[PDB]
């Protein structure tokens, strides 16, 4: 719809990776014992899933409602120091490991 | 001496933003 | 003759109380006044909103027992059009529409009614958002959402109920994680109450559906899919698990606690439908099931008490039969079956409140309601009685 | 919403003919044709009105929310609460 | 109404203001502009509207011939009712003009700068005043001659 290339924000975390977390918490009381590497894996994605849910539902949400203010431009104006006070927090974010 | 306005709020469209950051990225 | 002022009144949306109203009295418009045991009573298959859909609870106003809520998980036929489908179906009327439509964002996992109000909806989604919808108000959009926040559900959630009175409620809902939290209805964007719930060594369980002790807050019972039955008491003097159960071998599926009250008191007894066909009863003093069901293998769903006869209740196998369980004329043989035709996976049942009859959900949305035979829908003294001494058999 | 409201309104019968009518009398909208519907809908909209008097003259507090006529040929329908004013055309059974 | 939508719209504005937003003078001074263009078009509207009644409510000036010590005499004279015409004109330009601004002096109290916001230019109302200066002259016109009866007295038997 667009010629230019989007710079589209995402988030560094793969949805899946809970998935495997539940096989792991399935399977490790079904008797099956697993790589050891894998269940340290495992455990650090489920421990740190909230963060990343969190973040990504909040970045999904950002877009959403900017791209619905530029629909509308008579607004941008007004919304020009939120929007700022937000980029300047995903700044402070981005260089975080 | 009756003091008007400064300069408004920018907009710093996401576009030239996310693409500052981008290379902030790679450079990092 | 106006051509803009109709267009644009028609344009204006100042039709809520229009609509509902509308509603309200065309399906009653279908009565047709021209001047010139088990058994079949409703069968409700929205071609719209459960072409091809899963039913994924099921629920009867206690405030006015001819309104059931059943949900639906995202469909697999579309992504694009909305995935969470709520649907509100009515007891006043013969009619093939539903009485109310809902969306949600993400897959509604469980829905209710709330006792606290007659009319609010309360359901958890597969996000682990629980979602507030508004019946008297005619839209589409969640009217609230609790935050996706670490404190907050984020799990997906299974179970979501109303405890306490209507001047002492509290909304407990569960997260597969393992998180009990409890809302208000008045707000619903920070949890009153949370904790993650633990058994030992700090490992969480992965509850999938709780029950509680019948008029009786706090000291629920919860089970896990990884097979175990636990009691933990809500706040006591110690929150967490107080005890667990031996349990069934494979995940716990439904568990619901015993729900008539008479004579004497069986409040203490849990079904859990499990994975292995295996509705085993139990009680809270006994670590050991009371009593294994087996007539067949894999997956009966779910079980849920009569609330008006002590000692039946319904389960339903997802091969496609639902059968009835009276305890006391017999132990081991179905004293009343079905099968729904086209043998589908029926997934979810639900008792009405005051008995009578059943509420059987399915994997193709096709839900069926029915009621029982009146010589077993009664009960009485002697079936009280009775249930005491088959209870004193082992 | 309109075009659904009128799919499930005509769909619940299948029935021959209802249009929207927020207005007082003189609709615009069509089902099947313009004047069978316009004039028709006007003639409900001033008895209708007549019927309003006609019910407030027992007490004036009292209104007609809701008139059928089921006839030997016509099951005619109207839900008036203020402005909105229903037409259907249906078998009597 | 002009001025029950200028208070609603004012109000909105002020309800905006008290929470505290971002960036609130330009977007008032903005829709000020906007709100002063479409003021200028309406009222380009009613004043041609006006110059064509004239050629929208006026009121009926009427005056008399009336003779004293044997002079003719008017009353009120030409002037007057070319006076009143005037008055007319500014009280139909002041249903709009008068109306107050939006803000978070005379002229800042309150708008008058919808006749160089003229979708136009001066030409409407131009106009307008050239048919007061038209009417009048007609007038004028039609008294001369009649007026010309006084000088029977001042020529005697």
């Given at each position: ?5 989007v ?6 975390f ?14 490790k ?8 590497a ?6 650090q ?20 409602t ?19 006070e ?10 975080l490991? | ?7 408004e709020?920018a ?13 902030l990225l790679?450079?990092? | ?9 028609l ?18 418009a ?16 929205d ?6 859909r899963?039913?994924?609870?099921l ?7 001819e ?17 969470g ?29 709330a ?14 958002q ?9 839209k ?6 609790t935050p ?12 979501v ?31 009153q ?12 369980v ?9 008029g ?68 809270t003093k006994?670590?050991?099931?009371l ?12 079980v ?15 091969m ?11 132990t ?6 079905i099968?729904?035709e ?6 979810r ?13 399915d ?7 029915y009621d ?14 009775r249930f ?7 | ?25 003189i ?34 507090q ?11 040929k ?5 839900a ?14 | 109404?002009?001025?029950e ?16 937003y971002?960036?609130?003078?330009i ?11 479409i ?16 050629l ?23 002037e ?43 030409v ?10 038209g ?22 038997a």
């Amino acid at each position: 719809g667009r010629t230019g290339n989007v710079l589209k924000l995402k988030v560094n975390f793969l949805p899946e990776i809970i998935t495997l977390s539940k096989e792991v918490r399935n399977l490790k009381w079904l008797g099956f014992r697993v790589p050891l590497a894998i269940v340290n894996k495992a455990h650090q994605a489920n421990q740190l899933y909230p963060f990343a849910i969190s973040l990504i539902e909040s970045v999904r949400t950002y877009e959403r409602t900017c791209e619905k203010v530029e629909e509308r431009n008579t607004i941008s104006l007004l919304v020009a120091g939120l929007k700022k006070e937000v980029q300047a927090l995903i700044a402070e974010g981005i260089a975080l490991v | 001496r009756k003091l008007v306005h400064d300069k408004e709020l920018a907009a710093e469209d996401e576009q030239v933003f996310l693409m500052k950051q981008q290379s902030l990225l790679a450079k990092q | 003759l106006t051509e803009e002022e109709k267009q644009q009144i028609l344009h204006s949306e100042e039709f809520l109380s229009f609509f509902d109203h509308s509603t309200r009295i065309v399906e009653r418009a279908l009565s047709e006044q021209i001047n010139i045991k088990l058994s079949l009573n409703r069968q409700f298959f929205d071609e719209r909103w459960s072409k091809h859909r899963v039913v994924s609870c099921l629920d009867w106003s206690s405030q006015y027992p001819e309104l059931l809520v059943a949900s639906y998980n995202n469909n697999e036929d579309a992504p694009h059009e909305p995935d969470g489908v709520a649907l509100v179906w009515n007891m006043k009327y013969k009619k093939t529409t539903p009485e109310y439509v809902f969306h949600c964002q993400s897959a509604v996992m469980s829905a209710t009614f709330a006792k606290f109000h007659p009319n609010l909806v309360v359901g958890g989604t597969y996000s682990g958002q629980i979602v507030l919808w508004d019946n008297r108000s005619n839209k589409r959009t969640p009217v609230q959402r609790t935050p996706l926040s670490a404190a907050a559900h984020t799990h997906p959630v299974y179970c979501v109920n109303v405890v306490g009175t209507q001047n002492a409620h509290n909304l407990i809902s569960i997260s597969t994680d393992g998180k009990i939290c409890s809302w208000s209805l008045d707000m619903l964007s920070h949890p009153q109450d949370s904790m993650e719930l633990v058994h030992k060594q700090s490992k969480a369980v992965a509850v999938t559906s709780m029950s509680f002790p019948v008029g009786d807050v706090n000291n629920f019972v919860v089970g896990s899919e990884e097979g175990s039955v636990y009691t933990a008491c809500r706040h006591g003097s110690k929150a967490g698990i107080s005890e667990m159960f031996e349990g069934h071998q494979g995940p716990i599926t439904g568990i619901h606690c015993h729900a008539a009250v008479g004579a004497v008191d069986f409040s203490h007894l849990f079904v859990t439908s499990s994975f292995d066909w295996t509705v085993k009863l139990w009680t809270t003093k006994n670590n050991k099931p009371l009593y294994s069901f087996e007539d067949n293998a894999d997956y009966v769903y779910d079980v849920m008490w009569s609330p008006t006869h002590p000692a039946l209740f319904a389960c339903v196998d997802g091969m496609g039969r639902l059968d009835l369980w009276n305890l006391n004329n017999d132990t081991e043989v179905p004293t009343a079956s079905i099968s729904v035709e086209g043998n589908p996976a029926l997934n979810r049942v639900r008792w009405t409140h005051s008995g009578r009859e059943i509420a059987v959900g399915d994997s193709e949305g096709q839900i069926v309601i029915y009621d029982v035979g009146e010589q077993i829908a009664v009960p009485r003294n002697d079936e009280w009685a009775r249930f005491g001494r088959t209870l004193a058999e082992i | 919403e309109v075009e659904e409201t009128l799919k499930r309104l005509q769909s619940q019968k299948g029935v021959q003919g209802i249009i929207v009518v927020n207005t007082e009398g003189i609709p615009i909208k069509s089902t099947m044709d313009n004047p069978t519907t316009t004039q028709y809908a006007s003639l409900m909209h001033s008895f209708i009105l007549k019927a309003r008097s006609t019910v407030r003259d027992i007490d004036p507090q009292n209104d007609l929310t809701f008139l059928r006529i089921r006839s030997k040929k016509n099951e005619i329908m109207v839900a008036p609460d203020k402005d909105y004013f229903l037409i259907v055309i249906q078998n009597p059974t | 109404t002009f001025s029950e939508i200028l208070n609603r719209v004012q109000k909105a504005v002020d309800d905006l203001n008290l929470h505290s937003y971002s960036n609130l003078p330009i977007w008032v001074n903005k829709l000020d502009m906007e709100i002063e263009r479409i003021l200028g078009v309406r009222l380009q509207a009613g004043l041609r509207a006006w110059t064509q009644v004239l050629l929208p409510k006026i009121k009926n000036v009427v005056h008399e011939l009336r003779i004293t010590n044997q002079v003719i005499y008017l009353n009120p004279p030409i002037e007057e009712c070319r006076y009143k015409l005037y008055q007319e004109m500014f009280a139909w330009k002041m249903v709009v003009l008068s109306l107050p601004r939006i803000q978070s002096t005379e002229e800042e109290k309150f708008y008058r700068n919808a006749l160089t916001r003229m979708p136009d230019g001066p030409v409407a109302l131009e106009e307008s005043y050239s048919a007061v200066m038209g009417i009048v002259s007609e007038v004028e016109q039609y008294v001369k001659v009649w007026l010309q009866y006084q000088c029977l007295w001042d020529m005697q038997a």
